[PDB]
């Protein structure tokens, strides 16, 4: 899959397991159509989201549903979800990994773009 | 203002000046309604966004136009906008400071919530 | 003070109060010599560490006693101390603000350097 | 290896390649003795640092030499190196991965502890 999502839990120092992830692609009407989704594995990773054929250039939104994750651990978080909006570009490297580091009130989202 | 946004540049170690920030509030019909907007000052902070009277309970979206900030520095970044979605004032009125740290391929969001 | 340290709690979204901070300066013989120390205030900031006259060029080590902060909250964290090692005033005198964000298994260090 | 180091470059959105990493263990005299070292691979990862037999409980320091990395990319950084001081504990999970996210003026170090 040209798009992968990896999530780490900075409170427990663990992969963030069973975190729902939703990917949307922006349509011609400037609305977000569902594109792909899943839940992170025991390794905190979500594979198989899409294929090279389906992941064409465009604007994508990745929603990592962090609020539900922290609620299940018993910690009240700040945000509804971590949101990454980005443009997929064919000229750059072929694989996009969205790496999220989560704490309840602070979090980072980084794109590692490789091939 | 009960809502304050601070934007910093992690490449140069400086405040991020003149960055556009748009705040939306989810309406009854689930659409994002415009709420407030402004641009960060020389300190990287955006003050005067709203007031205690206007900033009622709700789901807010803070959109930091950030790709634009980096492109102004000659950097083609990964993400279009930093986006922070949070429920505000659900336990009663609070003061929210959202600090966004900008890197070309990465964004960090931190919220300090006080009384 | 040309050197300011701010400590924030990423689990609770609050300043980190009463955190011990020790600053060292590398001596001619390569040992770390004590330079200044203090404890963060209710805002999470430690002011009054040093002066323009005392903070000369050199290699400085900022040690944030942080494992101790987390252990006081009932959290057994990964790291003993947040540690920031930097050369200061090598291009001339500057003002340094170091912001440390504390999580149990993670620490983030940000420096804002101004004139 | 029970200890692994992974490093990401938030300016380029890439693994941080060829980054020198030094691990020290604290001795009875409170001095840091060299323990293991290496340089990150094309994946930004450093494998084979140690073995379960050699990595006993104690206090360890991981120095990721970030200054040299940013100098080779043409960006003046804040810090001499990212430093992680931590205590290895036999009761917890067996594998420690130190995950570093680097920008020139802001960086995070997280321990992912698994088995």
Short mmCIF file of N, CA and C in Angstrom, two decimals, chain C residues 23-90:
data_model
loop_
_atom_site.label_atom_id
_atom_site.label_comp_id
_atom_site.label_asym_id
_atom_site.label_seq_id
_atom_site.Cartn_x
_atom_site.Cartn_y
_atom_site.Cartn_z
N UNK C 23 21.19 23.77 35.20
CA UNK C 23 21.97 24.15 34.03
C UNK C 23 23.44 23.98 34.36
N UNK C 24 24.17 23.37 33.44
CA UNK C 24 25.61 23.21 33.53
C UNK C 24 26.28 23.86 32.34
N UNK C 25 27.55 24.22 32.51
CA UNK C 25 28.37 24.80 31.46
C UNK C 25 29.67 24.02 31.35
N UNK C 26 30.05 23.65 30.14
CA UNK C 26 31.25 22.85 29.98
C UNK C 26 32.48 23.69 30.30
N UNK C 27 33.32 23.19 31.20
CA UNK C 27 34.51 23.91 31.60
C UNK C 27 35.66 23.64 30.62
N UNK C 28 36.79 24.32 30.86
CA UNK C 28 37.95 24.15 29.99
C UNK C 28 38.44 22.71 29.97
N UNK C 29 38.25 21.97 31.06
CA UNK C 29 38.73 20.60 31.17
C UNK C 29 37.72 19.56 30.69
N UNK C 30 36.59 19.98 30.10
CA UNK C 30 35.52 19.14 29.54
C UNK C 30 34.51 18.65 30.57
N UNK C 31 34.68 18.95 31.85
CA UNK C 31 33.69 18.58 32.83
C UNK C 31 32.51 19.54 32.77
N UNK C 32 31.34 19.05 33.16
CA UNK C 32 30.17 19.91 33.29
C UNK C 32 30.25 20.65 34.62
N UNK C 33 30.37 21.97 34.57
CA UNK C 33 30.38 22.79 35.78
C UNK C 33 28.99 23.32 36.07
N UNK C 34 28.55 23.29 37.32
CA UNK C 34 27.25 23.89 37.66
C UNK C 34 27.21 25.35 37.22
N UNK C 35 26.05 25.75 36.70
CA UNK C 35 25.86 27.10 36.18
C UNK C 35 24.70 27.82 36.85
N UNK C 36 23.50 27.25 36.81
CA UNK C 36 22.37 27.85 37.48
C UNK C 36 21.37 26.74 37.70
N UNK C 37 20.45 26.96 38.64
CA UNK C 37 19.35 26.02 38.81
C UNK C 37 18.14 26.75 39.35
N UNK C 38 16.99 26.09 39.27
CA UNK C 38 15.77 26.63 39.84
C UNK C 38 14.63 25.65 39.66
N UNK C 39 13.42 26.11 39.98
CA UNK C 39 12.20 25.31 39.85
C UNK C 39 11.14 26.11 39.10
N UNK C 40 10.41 25.44 38.21
CA UNK C 40 9.37 26.11 37.43
C UNK C 40 8.26 26.62 38.34
N UNK C 41 7.66 27.72 37.91
CA UNK C 41 6.62 28.41 38.66
C UNK C 41 5.26 27.84 38.27
N UNK C 42 4.19 28.46 38.77
CA UNK C 42 2.84 27.99 38.47
C UNK C 42 2.52 28.06 36.98
N UNK C 43 3.19 28.92 36.22
CA UNK C 43 2.97 28.99 34.78
C UNK C 43 3.79 27.97 34.02
N UNK C 44 4.62 27.18 34.70
CA UNK C 44 5.52 26.26 34.05
C UNK C 44 6.83 26.87 33.62
N UNK C 45 7.05 28.15 33.89
CA UNK C 45 8.24 28.85 33.43
C UNK C 45 9.21 29.05 34.58
N UNK C 46 10.50 29.00 34.25
CA UNK C 46 11.55 29.25 35.23
C UNK C 46 12.27 30.51 34.76
N UNK C 47 12.05 31.61 35.47
CA UNK C 47 12.69 32.88 35.14
C UNK C 47 13.86 33.12 36.09
N UNK C 48 14.62 34.18 35.80
CA UNK C 48 15.71 34.56 36.68
C UNK C 48 16.87 33.60 36.77
N UNK C 49 17.02 32.69 35.79
CA UNK C 49 18.10 31.71 35.86
C UNK C 49 19.47 32.37 35.82
N UNK C 50 19.66 33.30 34.90
CA UNK C 50 20.97 33.90 34.69
C UNK C 50 20.80 35.34 34.21
N UNK C 51 21.91 35.96 33.82
CA UNK C 51 21.93 37.33 33.35
C UNK C 51 22.77 37.38 32.08
N UNK C 52 22.59 38.46 31.31
CA UNK C 52 23.40 38.66 30.11
C UNK C 52 24.89 38.64 30.45
N UNK C 53 25.27 39.17 31.61
CA UNK C 53 26.69 39.22 31.96
C UNK C 53 27.23 37.84 32.28
N UNK C 54 26.44 37.01 32.95
CA UNK C 54 26.91 35.70 33.35
C UNK C 54 26.84 34.67 32.23
N UNK C 55 25.93 34.85 31.27
CA UNK C 55 25.66 33.80 30.29
C UNK C 55 26.55 34.11 29.10
N UNK C 56 27.78 33.61 29.18
CA UNK C 56 28.79 33.91 28.18
C UNK C 56 28.70 32.82 27.13
N UNK C 57 29.52 32.92 26.08
CA UNK C 57 29.60 31.85 25.10
C UNK C 57 29.98 30.56 25.81
N UNK C 58 29.43 29.45 25.34
CA UNK C 58 29.87 28.16 25.83
C UNK C 58 28.91 27.07 25.41
N UNK C 59 29.21 25.87 25.89
CA UNK C 59 28.35 24.71 25.70
C UNK C 59 27.62 24.50 27.01
N UNK C 60 26.30 24.55 26.95
CA UNK C 60 25.43 24.47 28.10
C UNK C 60 24.62 23.18 28.06
N UNK C 61 24.33 22.65 29.24
CA UNK C 61 23.48 21.48 29.40
C UNK C 61 22.32 21.84 30.32
N UNK C 62 21.11 21.74 29.80
CA UNK C 62 19.92 21.96 30.60
C UNK C 62 19.36 20.60 30.98
N UNK C 63 19.30 20.33 32.28
CA UNK C 63 18.82 19.06 32.81
C UNK C 63 17.52 19.30 33.56
N UNK C 64 16.45 18.67 33.11
CA UNK C 64 15.13 18.85 33.69
C UNK C 64 14.80 17.59 34.47
N UNK C 65 14.60 17.72 35.77
CA UNK C 65 14.43 16.55 36.62
C UNK C 65 12.94 16.24 36.63
N UNK C 66 12.59 15.20 35.89
CA UNK C 66 11.36 15.05 35.12
C UNK C 66 10.76 13.71 35.48
N UNK C 67 11.60 12.68 35.41
CA UNK C 67 11.27 11.42 36.08
C UNK C 67 10.71 11.75 37.47
N UNK C 68 11.34 12.69 38.19
CA UNK C 68 10.82 13.07 39.50
C UNK C 68 9.44 13.72 39.40
N UNK C 69 9.22 14.53 38.36
CA UNK C 69 7.91 15.16 38.20
C UNK C 69 6.83 14.12 38.00
N UNK C 70 7.08 13.18 37.07
CA UNK C 70 6.11 12.14 36.76
C UNK C 70 5.88 11.22 37.95
N UNK C 71 6.96 10.82 38.63
CA UNK C 71 6.80 9.96 39.80
C UNK C 71 5.95 10.63 40.87
N UNK C 72 6.01 11.96 40.97
CA UNK C 72 5.14 12.66 41.91
C UNK C 72 3.67 12.57 41.51
N UNK C 73 3.38 12.32 40.23
CA UNK C 73 2.02 12.12 39.74
C UNK C 73 1.60 10.66 39.72
N UNK C 74 2.43 9.76 40.23
CA UNK C 74 2.14 8.34 40.22
C UNK C 74 2.54 7.62 38.96
N UNK C 75 3.36 8.22 38.11
CA UNK C 75 3.70 7.67 36.81
C UNK C 75 5.16 7.23 36.83
N UNK C 76 5.41 5.99 36.45
CA UNK C 76 6.78 5.52 36.33
C UNK C 76 7.21 5.74 34.89
N UNK C 77 8.02 6.75 34.62
CA UNK C 77 8.28 7.14 33.24
C UNK C 77 9.49 6.40 32.68
N UNK C 78 9.72 6.62 31.39
CA UNK C 78 10.84 5.97 30.73
C UNK C 78 12.17 6.61 31.10
N UNK C 79 12.25 7.93 30.98
CA UNK C 79 13.52 8.62 31.03
C UNK C 79 13.75 9.26 32.39
N UNK C 80 15.03 9.29 32.79
CA UNK C 80 15.40 9.88 34.08
C UNK C 80 15.30 11.39 34.03
N UNK C 81 15.85 11.99 32.99
CA UNK C 81 15.91 13.43 32.90
C UNK C 81 15.75 13.78 31.44
N UNK C 82 15.03 14.86 31.18
CA UNK C 82 15.17 15.51 29.90
C UNK C 82 16.49 16.27 29.92
N UNK C 83 17.23 16.18 28.81
CA UNK C 83 18.56 16.76 28.70
C UNK C 83 18.67 17.50 27.38
N UNK C 84 19.08 18.76 27.43
CA UNK C 84 19.25 19.60 26.25
C UNK C 84 20.67 20.15 26.29
N UNK C 85 21.46 19.83 25.27
CA UNK C 85 22.84 20.28 25.17
C UNK C 85 22.96 21.17 23.94
N UNK C 86 23.42 22.40 24.14
CA UNK C 86 23.47 23.35 23.04
C UNK C 86 24.61 24.33 23.26
N UNK C 87 25.15 24.84 22.15
CA UNK C 87 26.11 25.93 22.18
C UNK C 87 25.34 27.24 22.19
N UNK C 88 25.73 28.16 23.07
CA UNK C 88 24.99 29.40 23.22
C UNK C 88 25.91 30.58 22.93
N UNK C 89 25.33 31.60 22.30
CA UNK C 89 25.99 32.90 22.09
C UNK C 89 27.22 32.81 21.20
N UNK C 90 27.27 31.81 20.32
CA UNK C 90 28.42 31.60 19.45
C UNK C 90 28.45 32.60 18.30
#
